[PDB]
Amino acid sequence: GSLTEDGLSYKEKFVVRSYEVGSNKTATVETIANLLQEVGCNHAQSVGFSATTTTMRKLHLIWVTARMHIEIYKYPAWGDVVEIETWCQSEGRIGTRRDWILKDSVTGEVTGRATSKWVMMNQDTRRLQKVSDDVRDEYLVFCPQEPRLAFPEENNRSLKKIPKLEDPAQYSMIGLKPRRADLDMNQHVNNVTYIGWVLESIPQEIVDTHELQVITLDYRRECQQDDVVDSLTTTTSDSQFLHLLRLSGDGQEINRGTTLWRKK
Amino acid sequence: GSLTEDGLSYKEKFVVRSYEVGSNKTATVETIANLLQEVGCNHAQSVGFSATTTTMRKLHLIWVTARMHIEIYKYPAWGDVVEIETWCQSEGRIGTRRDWILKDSVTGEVTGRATSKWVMMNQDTRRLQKVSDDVRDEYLVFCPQEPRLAFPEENNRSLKKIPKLEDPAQYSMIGLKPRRADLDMNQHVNNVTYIGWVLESIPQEIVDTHELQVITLDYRRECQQDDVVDSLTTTTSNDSQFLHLLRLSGDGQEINRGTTLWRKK
Ligand SMILES: COc1cccc2c1CCCC(=O)N2
Numbered sequence: 001g002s003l004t005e006d007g008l009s010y011k012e013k014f015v016v017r018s019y020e021v022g023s024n025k026t027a028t029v030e031t032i033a034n035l036l037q038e039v040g041c042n043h044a045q046s047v048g049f050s051a052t053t054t055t056m057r058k059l060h061l062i063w064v065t066a067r068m069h070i071e072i073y074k075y076p077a078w079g080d081v082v083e084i085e086t087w088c089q090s091e092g093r094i095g096t097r098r099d100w101i102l103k104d105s106v107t108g109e110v111t112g113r114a115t116s117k118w119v120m121m122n123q124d125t126r127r128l129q130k131v132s133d134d135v136r137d138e139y140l141v142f143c144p145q146e147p148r149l150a151f152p153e154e155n156n157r158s159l160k161k162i163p164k165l166e167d168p169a170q171y172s173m174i175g176l177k178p179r180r181a182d183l184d185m186n187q188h189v190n191n192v193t194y195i196g197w198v199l200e201s202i203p204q205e206i207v208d209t210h211e212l213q214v215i216t217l218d219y220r221r222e223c224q225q226d227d228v229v230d231s232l233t234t235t236t237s238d239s240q241f242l243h244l245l246r247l248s249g250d251g252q253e254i255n256r257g258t259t260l261w262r263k264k
Numbered sequence: 265g266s267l268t269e270d271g272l273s274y275k276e277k278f279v280v281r282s283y284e285v286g287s288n289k290t291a292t293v294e295t296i297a298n299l300l301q302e303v304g305c306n307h308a309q310s311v312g313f314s315a316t317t318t319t320m321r322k323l324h325l326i327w328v329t330a331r332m333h334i335e336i337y338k339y340p341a342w343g344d345v346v347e348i349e350t351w352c353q354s355e356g357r358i359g360t361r362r363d364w365i366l367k368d369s370v371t372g373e374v375t376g377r378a379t380s381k382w383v384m385m386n387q388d389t390r391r392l393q394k395v396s397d398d399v400r401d402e403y404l405v406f407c408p409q410e411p412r413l414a415f416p417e418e419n420n421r422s423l424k425k426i427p428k429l430e431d432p433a434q435y436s437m438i439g440l441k442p443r444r445a446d447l448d449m450n451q452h453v454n455n456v457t458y459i460g461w462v463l464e465s466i467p468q469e470i471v472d473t474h475e476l477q478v479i480t481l482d483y484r485r486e487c488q489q490d491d492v493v494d495s496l497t498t499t500t501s502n503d504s505q506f507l508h509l510l511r512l513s514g515d516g517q518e519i520n521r522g523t524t525l526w527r528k529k
């Protein structure tokens with residue numbers, strides 16, 4: 001992959017692998033989510049971030065996901081080349097935004113798009129801080145100056161408020177525990193695991209007859225390596241669902257989201 | 265990737281991804297195992313296979329893993345290029361063998377090697393069978409005629425007999441269930457999941473202070489999407505060695521057995 005001519009976005013092509021595909025012989029949403037992370041990470045390295053700034057490191061500050069929104073029109077088939085373009089944008093003192101565009105490498109058609117909101121947190125106290133002037137200056141030089149949104153439409157699904165699922169849930173998957181392959185290089189549970197965990201409570205008949213079109217996820221708390229999770233789902237309707245990930249014991253909310261599925 | 269000049273092996277280069285690495289910033293054994301599968305699968309496609317032959321599809325026969333043996337000297341770092349060469353060999357009427365060699369793309373040094381034994385089985389009844397001559401003929405044309413082994417040594421750990429772990433186990437990880445990402449395109453639990461499940465019962469302090477050098481795995485039964493598994497480990501030993509056992513949570517039916525070898529960092 002490489003940064004574009006202007007140095008304000010990054011592009012990378014991926015060939016879909018045999019183990020990356022589902023029952024339909026196309027990449028899973030978890031494979032797509034892993035690819036968004038890989039292209040975002042390679043963009044971070046290409047601009048010297050490797051995604052902390054020097055001032056964030058001298059202050060024990062880290063970027064954490066608050067919201068992730070993915071919309072897939074066409075899942076690439078096993079063997080196809082998917083091209084992904086990604087870029088970051090400052091949102092004042094609120095935080096950063098990272099956007100992605102997925103294209104079919106042969107036709108050039110847009111096959112998917114994602115948006116993510118990131119916030120500043122102290123790595124130690126976990127207290128969230130508003131972005132200071134110094135951090136914005138270190139970041140803005142690698143961002144487009146004019147707004148560039150993967151989801152520009154007036155009143156779009158990427159900015160919708162998500163409600164809390166009320167008990168009893170229609171469907172559930174209980175006792176989910178993260179294994180070592182669910183941890184990143186810093187021993188934290190990876191964001192992709194939560195997507196898989198949310199989808200575990202969707203009935204197999206829905207999965208077999210429908211394709212996932214949209215997924216919006218709100219991150220409230222991190223799941224530890226020793227925590228046990230319950231995944232809950234209720235139909236709110238195309239088929240639409242409301243989801244909730246909470247700790248098995250105390251019931252502390254860790255995630256909430258919505259999914260939209262189209263008939264095949 | 266592509267087949268070699270002679271058409272008797274396949275080569276492919278892979279760049280190690282950010283999400284593919286562990287705490288050491290190097291590819292995990294599960295990432296390596298996924299890469300062996302990807303290169304083996306791309307070799308099957310390059311020579312006209314599904315890897316079933318015309319006669320195997322006509323008889324509802326499939327290839328299933330019986331043993332997998334991996335030995336890693338150096339794990340590639342996040343960003344490095346690993347080159348893998350793979351090939352198949354017939355073992356008479358017993359089954360097929362698939363071998364792999366992993367090299368550092370910059371130095372050309374061998375950083376790992378794997379060997380796997382495969383057996384013929386009816387997809388419906390799950391009954392094993394010795395390979396027929398018609399099937400052996402369709403396969404042999406894509407295999408080296410002279411023997412070509414990733415593990416040639418006169419006494420090698422890839423062919424050692426593995427005993428059954430006796431209760432009580434020293435360490436255990438209880439209630440492991442496969443999720444949808446553990447299933448392949450045919451809704452069967454992936455062989456990489458079993459590797460991860462075996463390693464779940466190894467203590468975190470062993471993992472933190474040691475690197476995995478060898479892993480031999482014997483496949484006895486398939487784990488279904490609705491089955492629950494217990495992973496058991498006992499130390500059998502500078503180097504640390506373990507004996508492992510995966511069994512169904514309920515009845516205790518053995519699904520896997522293996523050994524691991526770990527050296528100090
Ligand atoms: C959803 O994207 C993710 C998730 C986790 C980690 C990263 C990324 C890409 C952008 C930031 C980064 O450097 N790494």
Ligand SMILES: COc1cccc2c1CCCC(=O)N2
Nearest residue numbers: 300301304305308315380455
């Ligand atoms: C360990 O290698 C694996 C595991 C599972 C599936 C496959 C392979 C490669 C050789 C056969 C194949 O085409 N697919």
